Amino acid sequence: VTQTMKGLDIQKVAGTWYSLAMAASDISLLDAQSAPLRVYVEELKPTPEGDLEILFQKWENGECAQKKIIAEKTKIPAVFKIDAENKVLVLDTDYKKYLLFCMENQSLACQCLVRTPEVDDEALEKFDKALKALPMHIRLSFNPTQLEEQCHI
């Protein structure tokens, strides 16, 4: 991934988001509800120190779990670390409407986040252009009804 947001202000991505679409390099990363990168973003909480707390939902052991992770800042404003060593990259955002991001170790999953439970064609067009560059083999998108449900059921 060689697309990062120039001039990202991480404080301005705070608040409510919706995983409108997801894509990944390998089908098994997104195919089942319990697939390991099938994660439904709920909220972004950037720290004063410029780390990024992420609230999301994930299907585990036949139910919709609440999850929290902290993505630690790097010297690049648009790149963050989750290690156990995995990177979060912010590709593009207008803060008000949409945010595109990828998670990578090579394995890769990207999402189109939106602020509201609505299908944003413009945001989906920007997400498809960013994926043109990448070796994706699965792509999912959700309707407004699913966006208001736990784990997009």
Ligand X SMILES: CCCCOc1ccc(OCCCN2CCOCC2)cc1
Q: Which amino acid is at 91?
A: L
By a kind-dependent CB cut-off of 5 to 8 A, residue 103 interacts, out of its own copies, ligand X, none, with ligand X
In sequence order, what DSSP letters do the residues of 57-74 get, joined into one string?
Answer: EEEETTEEEEEEEEEEE-
Closest distance to its own copies from the beta carbon of 52 (Å) = 28
Q: Contact, 118 vs 31, CB < 8 A? A: no
By a kind-dependent CB cut-off of 5 to 8 A, residue 5 interacts, out of its own copies, ligand X, none, with none
Q: Is residue 112 a contact residue for ligand X (CB under 6 A)? A: no
Write the binding mask 31 to 70 for ligand X: x where contact by CB under 6 A, - elsewhere.
--------x-x--x-------x-x-x------------x-
In the three-class reduction of DSSP (H, G, I as helix; E, B as strand; rest coil), residue 136 is classed as coil
Q: Which two tokens stand for residue 137?
A: 């083999």
Q: Is residue 8 a contact residue for ligand X (CB under 6 A)? A: no
Longest dimension (CA), the chain: 41
Task: For tokens 């609505």, name the residue.
Answer: 118
Q: Is residue 147 a contact residue for its own copies (CB under 8 A)? A: no
Selected binder of ligand X within 59, 101, 127, 142 (CB under 6 A): 101
Closest distance to ligand X from the beta carbon of 135 (Å) = 19
Q: Which two tokens stand for residue 57?
A: 């939902």
